[PDB]
UniProtKB/TrEMBL annotation, chain B:
It comes from the Bacteria. Mg(2+) 3 binds at Q23. It is found in: Cytoplasm, Nucleoid. The hinge domain, which separates the large intramolecular coiled coil regions, allows the homodimerization, forming a V-shaped homodimer. Plays a central role in chromosome condensation, segregation and cell cycle progression. Functions as a homodimer, which is essential for chromosome partition. Involved in negative DNA supercoiling in vivo, and by this means organize and compact chromosomes. May achieve or facilitate chromosome segregation by condensation DNA from both sides of a centrally located replisome during cell division. Homodimerization via its hinge domain. Binds to DNA via its C-terminal region. Interacts, and probably forms a ternary complex, with MukE and MukF via its C-terminal region. The complex formation is stimulated by calcium or magnesium. Interacts with tubulin-related protein FtsZ. Belongs to the SMC family. MukB subfamily. Mg(2+) 2 binds at D22. This is Chromosome partition protein MukB.
TrEMBL record, chains C, E:
Involved in chromosome condensation, segregation and cell cycle progression. May participate in facilitating chromosome segregation by condensation DNA from both sides of a centrally located replisome during cell division. Not required for mini-F plasmid partitioning. Probably acts via its interaction with MukB and MukE. Overexpression results in anucleate cells. It has a calcium binding activity. It comes from Photorhabdus thracensis. This is Chromosome partition protein MukF. The chain holds residues 10 to 49 of 440 of the full protein. Belongs to the MukF family. It is found in: Cytoplasm, Nucleoid. Signal peptide: none annotated.
TrEMBL record, chain D:
It comes from Photorhabdus thracensis. The lineage of its organism: Bacteria, Pseudomonadati, Pseudomonadota, Gammaproteobacteria, Enterobacterales. It is found in: Cytoplasm, Nucleoid. This is Chromosome partition protein MukE. The gene is mukE. Interacts, and probably forms a ternary complex, with MukF and MukB. The complex formation is stimulated by calcium or magnesium. The keyword Zinc does not apply. InterPro entries: MukE_C, MukE_N, Scp_MukE.
TrEMBL record, chain F:
Keywords: Cell cycle, Cell division, Chromosome partition, Cytoplasm, DNA condensation. It comes from Photorhabdus thracensis. Belongs to the MukE family. GO terms for biological process: cell division; chromosome condensation; chromosome segregation; DNA replication. Interacts, and probably forms a ternary complex, with MukF and MukB. The complex formation is stimulated by calcium or magnesium. It is found in: Cytoplasm, Nucleoid. GO terms for cellular component: cytoplasm; nucleoid. This is Chromosome partition protein MukE. Involved in chromosome condensation, segregation and cell cycle progression. May participate in facilitating chromosome segregation by condensation DNA from both sides of a centrally located replisome during cell division. Probably acts via its interaction with MukB and MukF. It comes from the Bacteria.
């Protein structure tokens, strides 16, 4: 069943990987949001027109 | 470590392998022989004291 | 009707041998990647 | 001896970074944070405090602050170069331009040079890096290296910060809006320039 | 090792606006096609 | 809150110019009577005030006050160039004992130029101007211009006090001992200063 191990092996990381991205995206997004957030008070409020 | 970098490295190069072991007097002849056989099976170089 | 849909959408693809090769390489690394993430 | 708020600001843990780096010609923005995050709290106090050294912490309608020494400035004066103002204006456009927001503020020297050469005139620009240049690619490379060095000097003077692991990629301060001092209002750029030199904010080189 | 694999394979995918449009059009027709077969 | 006496010191009308010069890097010797006395009175607070910048307000054994930047100096540092270092040692060597027999405290650019040329090795002089040059008059003129530039640079730091005219004659302040070695009882100033210059 060594080959099964390789699947039993691989499928774990994939799963973890999915979960990892599941969090990572938010970690990126929440950061990006703040940039957008800062932008509104660092680009337009000073250049309203 | 090596397996991960297997893709980036061309197969023409097999990276140098070298570890250490101080106070080898702790080991028994069986353990030392097993270490030597494992290392050479893994093309592993050793520096033992 | 979909003709103008596409026309005003504007999209394209372009894979020279080297680019397509780089693509398979990135794909294989991702399949090998710990967390699927690829740093530049 | 001092008002409560001014002594408060001078007592803030961030205050020494602010004071020292402003004396060293660094300027206030979203980056250069330690000199901005609380100076937003005591702008008037720091300005009246700095007036004692015959220097003014000036804020335009923009949210950036920067130091300007008087003619009788106690801390001695100096100026920057034309190419510095150039890279600065390009950086200001990048800072304002929402299209590159996806960059999240991180930008590379190649992007900077591309935008600069796109907006500006290559040869008339290059006249100033070296007076004799006539479209030689050696002078173009010289200009690119000079852009790199001016970016470094602007980093020293609080306009840009190299990433901890990358000197090729950088994040921009809001002090970049200093470079838009001739465009912060709808008045003529030359009359505004006269008002800057009057307020010692800018001078021709 | 896969580098030469790709190199000697020699492949490419690309699509101007008109070609990509023609592609969606053929795809839609196939989705509408009686037997999925598309005659020239 | 803030220490009350530190508030008193910073509110002092002499605080602005003293602080500005200290940021510049200029030392404050005993010759600056008002600055020196103010520093002596309010050192206990000004040391903390500047250490907040990670800069140490050090009173030398000679008594002059100066800002020693730490590695983490919140005021980004500039430094005296190589020619500045050797011209500063030559200045101290122009302030040490032997100058009393030659210039009585008032020196000229010619004295410093001659001492630099005679004492300093030709190799370091060429390093200052250029390695390929060899004694040429134009290279000497460039070296003299650099000497004037570094002399003014030392002037900004309160290490040399110019006599008020365009002619390049001046006196040297005690703070110049930051360049030279620390004097010990029984040591020949000439010997130690020459060993350091060598």
């Amino acid at each position: 069943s060594e080959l099964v191990d390789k699947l039993v092996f691989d499928l774990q990381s994939k799963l973890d990987r999915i979960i990892s991205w599941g969090q990572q995206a938010i970690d990126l997004w929440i950061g990006y949001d703040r940039h957008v957030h800062k932008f509104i008070r660092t680009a337009i409020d000073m250049d309203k027109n | 470590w090596e397996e991960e970098s297997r893709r980036l490295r061309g197969k023409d190069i097999s990276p140098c392998r070298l570890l250490f072991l101080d106070q080898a007097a702790r080991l028994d002849a069986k353990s030392i022989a097993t270490l030597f056989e494992l290392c050479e099976r893994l093309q592993m170089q050793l520096i033992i004291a | 009707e979909l003709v103008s849909w596409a026309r005003k959408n504007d999209f394209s693809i372009s894979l020279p041998v080297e680019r397509l090769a780089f693509l398979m390489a990135i794909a294989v690394l991702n399949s090998e990647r710990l967390d699927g993430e690829m740093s530049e | 001896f001092m008002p409560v708020k001014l002594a408060q600001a001078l007592a803030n843990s961030l205050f020494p970074e602010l004071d020292s780096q402003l004396r060293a010609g660094r300027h206030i923005g979203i980056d250069d944070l330690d000199n901005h995050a609380f100076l937003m709290d005591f702008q008037e106090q720091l300005e009246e405090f700095y007036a004692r050294y015959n220097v003014e912490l000036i804020r335009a309608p923009e949210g950036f602050f920067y130091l300007r020494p008087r003619s009788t400035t106690l801390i001695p004066r100096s100026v920057l170069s034309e190419l510095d103002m150039m890279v600065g204006k390009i950086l200001c456009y990048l800072y304002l331009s929402p299209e590159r927001l996806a960059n999240q503020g991180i930008f590379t020297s190649q992007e900077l040079y591309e935008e600069l050469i796109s907006l500006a005139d290559e040869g008339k620009l290059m006249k100033f890096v070296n007076q004799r240049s006539s479209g030689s690619d050696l002078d173009k490379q010289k200009l690119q290296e000079k852009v790199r060095t001016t970016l470094n000097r602007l980093r020293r003077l609080g306009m840009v910060y190299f990433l901890p692991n990358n000197n090729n990629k950088f994040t921009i301060t809001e002090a970049v809006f200093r470079f838009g001092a001739d465009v912060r209002s709808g008045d003529d750029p030359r009359e505004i320039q006269l008002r800057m030199i009057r307020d010692g904010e800018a001078m021709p080189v």
